[PDB]
Scaffold this active site. Structure first.
Site, PDB file in Angstrom:
ATOM      1  N   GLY A  21       0.818  -1.218   0.000  1.00  0.00           N
ATOM      2  CA  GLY A  21       0.000   0.000   0.000  1.00  0.00           C
ATOM      3  C   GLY A  21       0.840   1.250   0.000  1.00  0.00           C
ATOM      4  O   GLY A  21       2.076   1.171   0.186  1.00  0.00           O
ATOM      5  N   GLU A 136       0.320  -5.306  13.164  1.00  0.00           N
ATOM      6  CA  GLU A 136      -0.122  -6.648  12.770  1.00  0.00           C
ATOM      7  C   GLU A 136      -0.538  -6.562  11.314  1.00  0.00           C
ATOM      8  O   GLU A 136      -0.936  -5.490  10.851  1.00  0.00           O
ATOM      9  CB  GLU A 136      -1.213  -7.179  13.699  1.00  0.00           C
ATOM     10  CG  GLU A 136      -2.600  -7.068  13.143  1.00  0.00           C
ATOM     11  CD  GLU A 136      -3.714  -7.438  14.126  1.00  0.00           C
ATOM     12  OE1 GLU A 136      -3.559  -8.486  14.764  1.00  0.00           O
ATOM     13  OE2 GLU A 136      -4.739  -6.659  14.258  1.00  0.00           O
ATOM     14  N   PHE A 137      -0.406  -7.638  10.587  1.00  0.00           N
ATOM     15  CA  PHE A 137      -0.925  -7.712   9.214  1.00  0.00           C
ATOM     16  C   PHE A 137      -2.435  -7.960   9.281  1.00  0.00           C
ATOM     17  O   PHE A 137      -2.810  -8.981   9.799  1.00  0.00           O
ATOM     18  CB  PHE A 137      -0.178  -8.771   8.418  1.00  0.00           C
ATOM     19  CG  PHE A 137      -0.709  -8.905   7.015  1.00  0.00           C
ATOM     20  CD1 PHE A 137      -0.571  -7.861   6.110  1.00  0.00           C
ATOM     21  CD2 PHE A 137      -1.430 -10.018   6.634  1.00  0.00           C
ATOM     22  CE1 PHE A 137      -1.127  -7.950   4.839  1.00  0.00           C
ATOM     23  CE2 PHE A 137      -1.924 -10.134   5.350  1.00  0.00           C
ATOM     24  CZ  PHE A 137      -1.775  -9.105   4.453  1.00  0.00           C
ATOM     25  N   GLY A 139      -4.648  -7.961   6.663  1.00  0.00           N
ATOM     26  CA  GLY A 139      -5.177  -8.592   5.437  1.00  0.00           C
ATOM     27  C   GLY A 139      -5.350  -7.593   4.317  1.00  0.00           C
ATOM     28  O   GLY A 139      -4.488  -6.737   4.141  1.00  0.00           O
ATOM     29  N   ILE A 140      -6.463  -7.683   3.617  1.00  0.00           N
ATOM     30  CA  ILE A 140      -6.720  -6.977   2.340  1.00  0.00           C
ATOM     31  C   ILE A 140      -7.956  -6.119   2.552  1.00  0.00           C
ATOM     32  O   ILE A 140      -8.900  -6.604   3.165  1.00  0.00           O
ATOM     33  CB  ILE A 140      -6.941  -7.991   1.195  1.00  0.00           C
ATOM     34  CG1 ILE A 140      -5.737  -8.921   1.011  1.00  0.00           C
ATOM     35  CG2 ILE A 140      -7.284  -7.267  -0.094  1.00  0.00           C
ATOM     36  CD1 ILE A 140      -4.442  -8.193   0.646  1.00  0.00           C
ATOM     37  N   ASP A 179     -13.008   8.708   8.622  1.00  0.00           N
ATOM     38  CA  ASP A 179     -12.541   8.423   7.237  1.00  0.00           C
ATOM     39  C   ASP A 179     -12.605   6.937   6.933  1.00  0.00           C
ATOM     40  O   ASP A 179     -11.610   6.391   6.405  1.00  0.00           O
ATOM     41  CB  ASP A 179     -11.112   8.925   7.005  1.00  0.00           C
ATOM     42  CG  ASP A 179     -10.808   9.145   5.524  1.00  0.00           C
ATOM     43  OD1 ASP A 179     -11.769   9.223   4.740  1.00  0.00           O
ATOM     44  OD2 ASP A 179      -9.618   9.175   5.176  1.00  0.00           O
ATOM     45  N   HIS A 181     -13.675   4.802   4.832  1.00  0.00           N
ATOM     46  CA  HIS A 181     -13.983   4.359   3.451  1.00  0.00           C
ATOM     47  C   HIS A 181     -13.537   2.894   3.300  1.00  0.00           C
ATOM     48  O   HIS A 181     -12.880   2.366   4.218  1.00  0.00           O
ATOM     49  CB  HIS A 181     -13.399   5.339   2.407  1.00  0.00           C
ATOM     50  CG  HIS A 181     -11.910   5.425   2.350  1.00  0.00           C
ATOM     51  ND1 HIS A 181     -11.118   4.353   1.966  1.00  0.00           N
ATOM     52  CD2 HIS A 181     -11.063   6.452   2.588  1.00  0.00           C
ATOM     53  CE1 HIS A 181      -9.838   4.713   1.982  1.00  0.00           C
ATOM     54  NE2 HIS A 181      -9.774   5.980   2.420  1.00  0.00           N
TER      55      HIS A 181
HETATM   56  C1  LIG Z   1      -2.311   4.536  11.527  1.00  0.00           C
HETATM   57  N1  LIG Z   1      -2.529   3.391  10.657  1.00  0.00           N
HETATM   58  C2  LIG Z   1      -2.766   2.130  11.031  1.00  0.00           C
HETATM   59  C3  LIG Z   1      -2.758   1.377   9.898  1.00  0.00           C
HETATM   60  C4  LIG Z   1      -2.581   2.294   8.845  1.00  0.00           C
HETATM   61  C5  LIG Z   1      -2.512   2.016   7.403  1.00  0.00           C
HETATM   62  C6  LIG Z   1      -2.561   3.041   6.454  1.00  0.00           C
HETATM   63  C7  LIG Z   1      -2.499   2.706   5.107  1.00  0.00           C
HETATM   64  C8  LIG Z   1      -2.370   1.363   4.772  1.00  0.00           C
HETATM   65  S1  LIG Z   1      -2.300   0.654   3.195  1.00  0.00           S
HETATM   66  C9  LIG Z   1      -2.241  -0.934   3.867  1.00  0.00           C
HETATM   67  C10 LIG Z   1      -2.248  -0.966   5.231  1.00  0.00           C
HETATM   68  C11 LIG Z   1      -2.123  -2.223   6.014  1.00  0.00           C
HETATM   69  C12 LIG Z   1      -2.316  -3.466   5.409  1.00  0.00           C
HETATM   70  C13 LIG Z   1      -2.326  -4.602   6.207  1.00  0.00           C
HETATM   71  N2  LIG Z   1      -2.150  -4.584   7.540  1.00  0.00           N
HETATM   72  C14 LIG Z   1      -1.939  -3.389   8.101  1.00  0.00           C
HETATM   73  C15 LIG Z   1      -1.918  -2.193   7.394  1.00  0.00           C
HETATM   74  C16 LIG Z   1      -2.313   0.399   5.788  1.00  0.00           C
HETATM   75  N3  LIG Z   1      -2.360   0.721   7.080  1.00  0.00           N
HETATM   76  N4  LIG Z   1      -2.411   3.538   9.312  1.00  0.00           N
END
Ligand SMILES: Cn1ccc(-c2ccc3scc(-c4ccncc4)c3n2)n1
Length: 328
Positions: A21, A136-137, A139-140, A179, A181
């Site tokens: 991302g 943490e991961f 997902g999607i 936000d 979305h």
């Molecule tokens: C303050 N904050 C907490 C998570 C985020 C964030 C922002 C853009 C994006 S674009 C992809 C992810 C993401 C994907 C998978 N697992 C965690 C985060 C992501 N996480 N920002």
């Protein structure tokens, strides 16, 4: 003070990095530590250069995101107001150096496979500060899963999980996401059949339908403890309130209408607006691998439609969770 990239991302962790991302803010990589995927969010701070067309945040300006990330993560460990529905935060580091070439490698792969809107982050000097957030991961995101979900039963689980998570954060922290979305709702396989939350000391469960939801991105978010409010003041931003082509951009306007352009105040109705926008996406832009063919299935469909029609007459995610027929 600040550490090299290598303190967060030792070689092995750098080598398994893969970009997943991006935003104006910077870059998000997935990697593996102790057999366990994590998401690395990397944000340049304190520097005079434009990045992805915008000025870098100061430390002060990035603190809110760290603070809110932490507070929401800690709900997984709380007792009266407990939810795992926000993305777990593992660690925060202030890093100094040029961008690791191995991250540029992953950035390039992403740019040629999916294409980036961002500058190639190769122009940073050895004095550049970043904040590295390890999550943490989760997902999607729901947007990328538009065509991927089993059925509207899944849709209901997701709305239930999101409503409960926001209600717990309302109760604990007077939280508004502001936000939410469908890019900011992540989905991950779980083998748990039932997910647990506690709201004001009352514990309940939600059928997972095999998915764990994680809420992300606190750009616009607001919450408070002991009357100290952390929030993003968009009273003077103009761009945010002039979008169109998607109900998303109406929510920004409906929020400002609700809060009289006072972003420091608590208006949990913003969480109801976002849940309405997400219910709207479930009914109108999601397409399910199985439609509602059987009786019980059309039942669920009518309940979500009835939710769509009724939910805007509720005052908070808390009010929805506790009083809406969808959840009974
Ligand atoms: C303050 N904050 C907490 C998570 C985020 C964030 C922002 C853009 C994006 S674009 C992809 C992810 C993401 C994907 C998978 N697992 C965690 C985060 C992501 N996480 N920002």
């Amino acid at each position: 003070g600040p550490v090299p990239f290598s303190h967060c991302l030792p070689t092995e962790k750098l080598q398994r990095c893969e970009k997943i991302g991006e935003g104006v803010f910077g870059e998000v990589f997935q990697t593996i530590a102790d057999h366990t995927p994590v998401a690395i969010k990397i944000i340049a701070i304190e520097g005079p250069d434009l990045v992805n067309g915008s000025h870098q945040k100061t430390f002060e300006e990035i603190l809110p995101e760290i603070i809110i990330s932490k507070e929401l993560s800690l709900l997984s460990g709380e007792v009266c107001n407990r939810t795992e529905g926000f993305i777990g935060l593992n660690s925060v580091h202030c890093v100094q150096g040029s961008y690791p070439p191995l991250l540029l490698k992953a950035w390039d792969h992403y740019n040629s496979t999916k294409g980036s809107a961002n500058d190639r982050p190769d122009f940073f000097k050895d004095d550049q500060l970043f904040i590295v957030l390890e999550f943490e991961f989760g997902g999607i995101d729901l947007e990328q899963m538009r065509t991927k979900l089993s059925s509207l039963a899944t849709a209901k689980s997701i709305l239930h999980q999101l409503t409960a998570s926001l209600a717990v954060a309302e109760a604990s922290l007077r939280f508004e996401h502001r936000d939410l979305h469908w890019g900011n709702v992540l989905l991950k396989k779980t083998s748990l059949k039932k997910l647990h939350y506690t709201l004001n000391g009352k514990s309940s469960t939600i059928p997972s339908c095999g998915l764990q939801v994680s809420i992300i991105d606190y750009t616009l978010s607001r919450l408070e403890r002991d009357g100290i409010v952390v929030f993003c003041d968009v009273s003077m931003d103009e761009d945010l309130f002039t979008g169109d082509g998607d109900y998303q951009f109406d929510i920004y306007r409906l929020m400002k209408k609700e809060n009289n352009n006072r972003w420091g105040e608590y208006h949990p109705y913003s969480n109801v607006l976002w849940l309405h926008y997400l219910t709207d996406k479930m009914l109108k832009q999601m397409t399910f691998k199985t439609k509602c063919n059987t009786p019980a299935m059309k039942q669920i469909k009518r309940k979500i439609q009835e939710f769509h029609r009724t939910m805007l007459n509720f005052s908070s995610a808390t009010d929805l969770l506790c009083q809406h027929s969808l959840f009974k």
